[PDB]
């Protein structure tokens, strides 16, 4: 958010949390390319974006 909506967390024990929510850029780069492969390269692809 470009440092807008600054927020922070409390400071206490969080024993058993797990948040598998992330990936490397290569994953993102790969997915982006894959996304570009599964479209008709005419205007039909661009317009929704």
């Amino acid at each position: 958010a470009n440092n807008l909506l600054n927020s922070t967390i409390p400071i206490s024990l969080r024993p058993t949390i797990l948040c598998p929510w992330f990936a490397s850029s290569e994953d993102l780069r790969l997915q982006q390319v894959m996304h570009l492969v599964n479209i008709s390269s005419n205007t039909a692809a661009a317009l929704p974006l």
Partner: protein, 50 residues
């Protein structure tokens, strides 16, 4: 990249390939002959822009 008035730097094509050209032996060929091309354009109106 946004090029500006540089004739030699005008980007004519954006390309993507589904296969490795080296396997096909296309290693020395024009890139346009080996990669797919995007083609989409939107006809905006100057009057609204102004």
């Amino acid at each position: 990249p946004f090029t500006r008035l540089v004739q030699n730097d005008v980007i004519t094509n954006v390309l993507v390939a589904r296969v490795d050209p080296a396997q096909r032996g296309d290693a020395a060929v024009d890139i346009r002959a080996t990669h797919a091309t995007f083609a989409a354009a939107l006809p905006v109106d100057p009057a609204a822009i102004v």
